[PDB]
Design an enzyme around this catalytic site. Sequence first.
Site, short mmCIF file in Angstrom:
data_model
loop_
_atom_site.label_atom_id
_atom_site.label_comp_id
_atom_site.label_asym_id
_atom_site.label_seq_id
_atom_site.Cartn_x
_atom_site.Cartn_y
_atom_site.Cartn_z
N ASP A 152 0.75 -1.21 0.00
CA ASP A 152 0.00 0.00 0.00
C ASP A 152 0.81 1.30 0.00
OD1 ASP A 152 1.03 -0.02 2.53
OD2 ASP A 152 -0.91 -0.02 3.59
N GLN A 181 2.71 2.58 2.19
CA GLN A 181 2.90 3.11 3.51
C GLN A 181 3.84 2.17 4.22
OE1 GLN A 181 -0.04 5.79 4.56
NE2 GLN A 181 -1.53 4.06 3.81
N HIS A 237 28.97 7.01 5.07
CA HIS A 237 30.33 6.35 5.23
C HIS A 237 30.46 5.18 4.21
CE1 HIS A 237 33.67 4.67 7.90
NE2 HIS A 237 33.21 3.54 7.30
N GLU A 238 29.31 4.41 4.18
CA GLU A 238 29.15 3.23 3.28
C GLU A 238 29.29 3.53 1.76
OE1 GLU A 238 30.10 0.56 4.64
OE2 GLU A 238 29.57 1.08 6.64
N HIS A 242 32.65 4.53 0.71
CA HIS A 242 33.61 3.47 0.36
C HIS A 242 33.49 3.15 -1.15
CE1 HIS A 242 35.53 2.18 4.01
NE2 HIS A 242 34.35 2.01 4.64
N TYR A 249 42.68 -1.64 1.49
CA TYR A 249 42.15 -1.67 2.84
C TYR A 249 43.05 -2.30 3.89
CZ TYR A 249 38.02 -1.06 5.90
OH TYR A 249 37.08 -0.79 6.82
N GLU A 286 39.31 4.64 5.57
CA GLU A 286 38.30 4.83 6.67
C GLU A 286 38.04 6.33 6.97
OE1 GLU A 286 36.45 1.87 6.82
OE2 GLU A 286 36.26 3.19 8.64
N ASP A 334 27.29 16.75 13.93
CA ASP A 334 28.34 16.83 14.92
C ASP A 334 29.55 16.22 14.26
OD1 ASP A 334 26.35 14.36 16.07
OD2 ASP A 334 28.13 13.79 15.08
N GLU A 364 31.03 13.50 15.53
CA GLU A 364 31.12 12.15 16.09
C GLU A 364 30.53 11.20 15.01
OE1 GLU A 364 32.73 13.78 18.89
OE2 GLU A 364 32.00 11.78 19.53
N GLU A 375 26.65 8.08 16.34
CA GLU A 375 25.96 8.38 17.60
C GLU A 375 24.43 8.04 17.67
OE1 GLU A 375 27.40 10.65 15.58
OE2 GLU A 375 25.53 11.67 14.84
N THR A 382 24.61 2.06 20.98
CA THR A 382 24.28 1.86 22.40
C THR A 382 23.12 2.68 22.84
OG1 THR A 382 25.80 3.53 23.16
CG2 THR A 382 26.68 1.28 23.04
N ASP A 404 27.38 9.00 23.87
CA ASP A 404 28.63 8.37 23.34
C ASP A 404 28.52 8.20 21.79
OD1 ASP A 404 26.49 6.44 23.44
OD2 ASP A 404 27.92 4.87 24.14
N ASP A 406 42.67 -5.58 12.90
CA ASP A 406 41.86 -4.59 12.18
C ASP A 406 42.51 -4.13 10.92
OD1 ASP A 406 39.75 -2.70 11.61
OD2 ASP A 406 40.81 -1.28 12.79
N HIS A 409 40.62 1.10 11.32
CA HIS A 409 39.62 1.81 12.09
C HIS A 409 40.17 2.59 13.33
CE1 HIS A 409 37.07 -1.11 9.93
NE2 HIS A 409 36.21 -0.09 9.84
C1 LIG Z 1 31.98 -2.10 15.49
C2 LIG Z 1 32.07 -1.68 14.05
C3 LIG Z 1 30.91 -0.76 13.82
C4 LIG Z 1 33.27 -0.85 13.76
C5 LIG Z 1 33.82 -1.09 12.32
N1 LIG Z 1 32.93 -0.66 11.23
C6 LIG Z 1 32.75 0.60 10.82
O1 LIG Z 1 33.37 1.55 11.33
C7 LIG Z 1 31.72 0.77 9.70
C8 LIG Z 1 30.30 0.88 10.33
C9 LIG Z 1 30.21 2.05 11.33
C10 LIG Z 1 30.33 3.35 10.53
C11 LIG Z 1 28.81 1.90 11.89
O2 LIG Z 1 31.83 -0.32 8.78
P1 LIG Z 1 32.89 -0.49 7.57
O3 LIG Z 1 32.17 0.11 6.33
O4 LIG Z 1 34.06 0.25 7.81
C12 LIG Z 1 33.04 -2.27 7.67
N2 LIG Z 1 33.56 -2.48 6.40
C13 LIG Z 1 34.47 -3.45 6.27
O5 LIG Z 1 34.99 -4.19 7.10
O6 LIG Z 1 34.77 -3.58 4.98
C14 LIG Z 1 35.68 -4.61 4.40
C15 LIG Z 1 35.09 -5.44 3.20
C16 LIG Z 1 35.66 -5.52 1.95
C17 LIG Z 1 34.97 -6.27 0.98
C18 LIG Z 1 33.86 -7.00 1.26
C19 LIG Z 1 33.27 -6.96 2.47
C20 LIG Z 1 33.89 -6.09 3.39
C21 LIG Z 1 34.61 -2.36 12.02
O7 LIG Z 1 34.24 -3.13 11.09
O8 LIG Z 1 35.68 -2.66 12.67
CA LIG Z 2 24.53 5.63 22.68
CA LIG Z 3 27.56 12.00 13.51
CA LIG Z 4 2.79 -1.10 3.82
CA LIG Z 5 24.41 13.73 14.75
ZN LIG Z 6 34.46 1.97 6.73
#
Ligand SMILES: CC(C)C[C@H](NC(=O)[C@H](CC(C)C)OP(=O)(O)CNC(=O)OCc1ccccc1)C(=O)O
Ligand SMILES: [Ca+2]
Ligand SMILES: [Ca+2]
Ligand SMILES: [Ca+2]
Ligand SMILES: [Ca+2]
Ligand SMILES: [Zn+2]
Length: 316
Positions: free
Chosen positions: A59, A61, A142-143, A146, A157, A166, A185, A187, A190, A194, A200, A226, A231
């Site tokens: 629908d 929505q 961020h996604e 990449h 990477y 990153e 911001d 950060e 956020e 959590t 945070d 990592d 990261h």
């Molecule tokens: C605890 C995580 C959120 C921290 C961290 N990831 C991040 O900082 C962010 C998500 C945040 C912005 C919410 O995710 P990334 O986009 O950096 C994870 N990417 C990632 O690991 O990419 C590698 C890859 C290459 C090819 C195929 C698959 C994957 C990590 O993977 O270490």
């Molecule tokens: Ca939080």
């Molecule tokens: Ca932010």
């Molecule tokens: Ca719907």
């Molecule tokens: Ca914000």
């Molecule tokens: Zn990333």
Amino acid sequence: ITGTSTVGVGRGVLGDQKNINTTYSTYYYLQDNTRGDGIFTYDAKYRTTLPGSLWADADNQFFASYDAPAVDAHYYAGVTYDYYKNVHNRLSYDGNNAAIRSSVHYSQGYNNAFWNGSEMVYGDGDGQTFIPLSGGIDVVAHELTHAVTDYTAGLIYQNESGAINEAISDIFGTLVEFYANKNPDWEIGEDVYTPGISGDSLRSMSDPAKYGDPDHYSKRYTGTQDNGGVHINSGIINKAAYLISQGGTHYGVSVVGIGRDKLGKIFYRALTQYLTPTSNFSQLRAAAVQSATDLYGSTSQEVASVKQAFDAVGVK
Ligand SMILES: CC(C)C[C@H](NC(=O)[C@H](CC(C)C)OP(=O)(O)CNC(=O)OCc1ccccc1)C(=O)O
Ligand SMILES: [Ca+2]
Ligand SMILES: [Ca+2]
Ligand SMILES: [Ca+2]
Ligand SMILES: [Ca+2]
Ligand SMILES: [Zn+2]
């Protein structure tokens, strides 16, 4: 899907109502035909098989709880597309209007989001460390960023080039968050991190050390986890980018701020014209100085703020 362009309305992860661009053909699909060759949102149905099913609704929505992460991934990918087009003149991630695809509800209790080489993927979080990741505009951008890097500089990477990769993702996710003026911001994450703790975030650009990330080159991580701290060491670049924009005294080095827009212009030009797959921190420094030189003149304040910023975090 071939059908009629329309507009539906839904509620996002944070409970905010928004309109989204859909396509009508028997069902209403999360397919926005208004941007490049389209933005497409898929249901991965708690599985890891990608992309899943193009999202279908009866629908137009989208208020069910299960709809939330799809609403925000589809809407935020439109905002990001728009920032790139309007601010930098780039059509989609490849610069040629490539279709943008995202899958939500990937796996079960998945605490992450990623670009897999061809699409965006968003976990729902486990409910305590994260809520569904597409609810964060800086996470979305961020996604998508990449993909932008992958199509341009192509930063490998791992190690220095990976931490640059990153940092780019964090700097442009923050720029798109101020562009949309969505409580912006310096950060990261956020809005979705959590849900029980206020105040945070996952990472801090203004003070990376707040969460234990380095804010100086002398404090870089040299280990192995990592992917060599991609990261972790991104904090050294993030802090430099925050100083260029906002100004401040860091480790006794004073930086005059030049603002966010110039920061965005110098970083994009460095990303698209000067960085390579294997660029390291010192090369990023040269690339940012050259960009700022190209744009504002060798003797500008802009160029001087870029040098000070890097000298403040110990890069060169
Ligand atoms: C605890 C995580 C959120 C921290 C961290 N990831 C991040 O900082 C962010 C998500 C945040 C912005 C919410 O995710 P990334 O986009 O950096 C994870 N990417 C990632 O690991 O990419 C590698 C890859 C290459 C090819 C195929 C698959 C994957 C990590 O993977 O270490
Ligand atoms: Ca939080
Ligand atoms: Ca932010
Ligand atoms: Ca719907
Ligand atoms: Ca914000
Ligand atoms: Zn990333």
